[PDB]
Design a protein around this ligand. Sequence first.
Ligand code: HEC
Ligand code: HEC
Ligand code: HEC
Ligand code: HEC
Ligand SMILES: [Cl-]
Ligand SMILES: [Cl-]
Ligand SMILES: [Zn+2]
Ligand SMILES: [Zn+2]
Ligand SMILES: [Zn+2]
Ligand SMILES: [Zn+2]
Ligand SMILES: [Zn+2]
Ligand SMILES: [Zn+2]
Ligand SMILES: [Zn+2]
Ligand SMILES: [Zn+2]
Ligand SMILES: [Zn+2]
Ligand SMILES: [Zn+2]
Ligand SMILES: [Zn+2]
Ligand SMILES: [Zn+2]
Ligand SMILES: [Zn+2]
Ligand SMILES: [Zn+2]
Ligand SMILES: [Zn+2]
Ligand SMILES: [Zn+2]
Lengths: 106, 106, 106, 106
Amino acid sequence: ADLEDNMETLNDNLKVIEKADNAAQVKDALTKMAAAASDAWSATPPKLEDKSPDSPEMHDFRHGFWILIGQIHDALHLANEGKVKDAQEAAEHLKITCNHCHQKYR
Amino acid sequence: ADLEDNMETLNDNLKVIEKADNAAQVKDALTKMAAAASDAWSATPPKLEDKSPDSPEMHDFRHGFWILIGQIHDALHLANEGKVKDAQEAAEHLKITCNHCHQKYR
Amino acid sequence: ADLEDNMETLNDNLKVIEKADNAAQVKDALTKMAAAASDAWSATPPKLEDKSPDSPEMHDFRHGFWILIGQIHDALHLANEGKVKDAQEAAEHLKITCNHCHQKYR
Amino acid sequence: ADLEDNMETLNDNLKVIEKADNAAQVKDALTKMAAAASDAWSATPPKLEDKSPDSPEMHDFRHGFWILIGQIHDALHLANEGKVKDAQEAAEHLKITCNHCHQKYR
Ligand code: HEC
Ligand code: HEC
Ligand code: HEC
Ligand code: HEC
Ligand SMILES: [Cl-]
Ligand SMILES: [Cl-]
Ligand SMILES: [Zn+2]
Ligand SMILES: [Zn+2]
Ligand SMILES: [Zn+2]
Ligand SMILES: [Zn+2]
Ligand SMILES: [Zn+2]
Ligand SMILES: [Zn+2]
Ligand SMILES: [Zn+2]
Ligand SMILES: [Zn+2]
Ligand SMILES: [Zn+2]
Ligand SMILES: [Zn+2]
Ligand SMILES: [Zn+2]
Ligand SMILES: [Zn+2]
Ligand SMILES: [Zn+2]
Ligand SMILES: [Zn+2]
Ligand SMILES: [Zn+2]
Ligand SMILES: [Zn+2]
C-alpha cells in the first residue's frame, strides 16, 4: 500500500490495542501493524522526494521502521504469553517511535 | 516482488557480502536484503496455502523474517562503523535463519 | 554494585545524555548505563523478596532490563555513527522502560 | 563471577538445551545463560588486558554479549509459548555467537 494507507492502518490498530479487552484483539492488531510497517519500509516520504534513496536521510527514515518492527515483535511475544496489560503497555513504547519519525520526516 | 524473487535477492546479496572487499558493497547488499525481507513478510509460501493465516505455522513463518530483519539491522550498523569483517561475519548469522525457515516451510 | 547504585548510575547518565553536546559524552554515558543494566539484571528488588525467583513477577522484572539493554545497544550504534541528536532522542525511548518497571516493582 | 566461570555456565546450559525434553528445563537453562552473559559483560579477557576499556576491541568484545543476550531473550519467549523444538533450535543460533567471540578474543 502507499505510505498514507500504511499510516492509517498503524493509527487504527494502535487505538484497538489501547481499547482492547482480550489477547486475540491485541494479537490481531499487532500482526496488522507489523504488516503495515514492513510494507511502509520501502516508501519515499514527501519531505525526501528530492534526496537519493541511499542518502543519510532515507537510511535514518528506514531505521525508524526497524525500531517499530522490533517493538511490535516484542509486544506480540508478550501478547502470546496471556500478558494483555503488558502487551497493551507496548502502545506507550510504539507512540515514541511514531512521534520521533513524524518530528523529522512529515 | 513475489516470495521467490525476494529469495533470489537474499541469495545473490548474501554472496556479495561473503565476497565483498569494502564497506560500500556490504552496506548496499545489506540494504537490498532488508528490502527483500520486509517485502517477503506478507507472503504465503506454497507448503502453507492449506493453513489458516493465524495458524501456528504462518505465525512461526512470519517470526523467521523478524529474526532475519533484526540480524540485517545489526549487520548494517556494524557496516556503518567501517567494521567490514564484523559485518561480513553477520553472513554466518543470517545463514542459520535461512536454513531454519527452509527446513520447516520450503 | 547493588540495585540502588545501578539505578543512580542509570539516572545520572540519562541526564548527561539529555544535556550532552558531542558524541564522546553520549557514547561514554551509554556505555556506563549498559554496565549498570547488565549488573542490575540479577538483583531481587525489595517489593519482590516474598516472591519465588521463577514467579511471573521476577521474569517480567528481568524482561524490563532486556528491553533497556536492547535500547542502549541501538542508541550506542547511532552514537558511533556521529548521529548525536538521534542517539540523544534514545533518552525519550529509555524513560518509558524506566517508568514501566518502576510502576510495577519500585 | 569471573569470565571462565560464566563460560562454563554458558557451556553446561547450552548442552542442557540441546538434550532437553520439556519447556521447564529449556526455560531454566536459558535464564541461567542470560545471568552468566550479563555478569560476563563487564569482564576483561586475557587477550585484551593491555588495551584501554573504551578501545575499539573492548567495545566489539562487549557487543558480542549484546548479540548473545538478545538471542537468549528471543529463545526464552519461544520457550514461554510451549515451542520446545523452536527454543532448542535457538542453540544453533547461540553457537555462532560463541564461536565468533572465541575466534577474535580467546
Ligand atoms: C517513519 C519512520 C514513521 C514511523 C515509524 C511512523 N510514521 Fe506515521 N507517518 C510518517 C510520514 C512520513 C508520514 C507522512 C506521510 C505523508 O504522505 O504525508 C506519516 C503520516 C502519518 C499519519 C497521517 C496523518 C498526518 O498528519 O499526515 C498518521 C495518522 C500516522 N502517520 C500514524 C502513525 C502511527 C500511529 C505510527 C506508529 C504506531 C506511525 N505513524 C509511525 C512516518 C512514520
Ligand atoms: C522464511 C521465514 C524464510 C527465510 C527467513 C528465508 N527463506 Fe528462502 N525461502 C523460503 C521459502 C518458503 C522458500 C520457497 C518458496 C517457494 O515458492 O517454493 C524459499 C526459497 C528460497 C530459495 C529458492 C527460490 C527458488 O528459486 O525457488 C533460495 C535461493 C532462498 N530461499 C534463499 C534464502 C536466503 C539466502 C535466505 C537468508 C539470507 C533465506 N532464503 C531466508 C522461506 C524463507
Ligand atoms: C526494572 C526492570 C527497572 C528498570 C528498567 C529501571 N529501574 Fe529504576 N528502579 C527499579 C527498582 C526496583 C527500584 C527500587 C529499588 C529499591 O531498592 O527500592 C528503582 C529505583 C530507581 C531510582 C531510585 C533509587 C534510590 O535512591 O532509592 C532511580 C533514580 C531510578 N530507579 C532510575 C532509573 C532510570 C533512570 C532508569 C532507566 C533509564 C531505570 N531506573 C530503569 C527498577 C527498574
Ligand atoms: C565474547 C563476547 C564471548 C562470547 C559471546 C562467548 N564467549 Fe566463551 N569465552 C570467551 C573468552 C574471552 C574466553 C576465554 C576466557 C579465558 O580466560 O581464557 C571464553 C572461554 C570459553 C570457554 C572455556 C574453554 C576455553 O577453551 O578457554 C568455554 C567452555 C566457553 N567460552 C563457552 C562459551 C559458550 C558455550 C558460549 C555461548 C553460548 C560462549 N562461550 C560465548 C568469550 C566469549
Ligand atoms: Cl524512533
Ligand atoms: Cl557474534
Ligand atoms: Zn481508519
Ligand atoms: Zn521480550
Ligand atoms: Zn510467537
Ligand atoms: Zn526514536
Ligand atoms: Zn514486492
Ligand atoms: Zn549491535
Ligand atoms: Zn544506521
Ligand atoms: Zn532459527
Ligand atoms: Zn555490581
Ligand atoms: Zn538501529
Ligand atoms: Zn559498535
Ligand atoms: Zn515497557
Ligand atoms: Zn560444568
Ligand atoms: Zn521473537
Ligand atoms: Zn516472558
Ligand atoms: Zn557474530
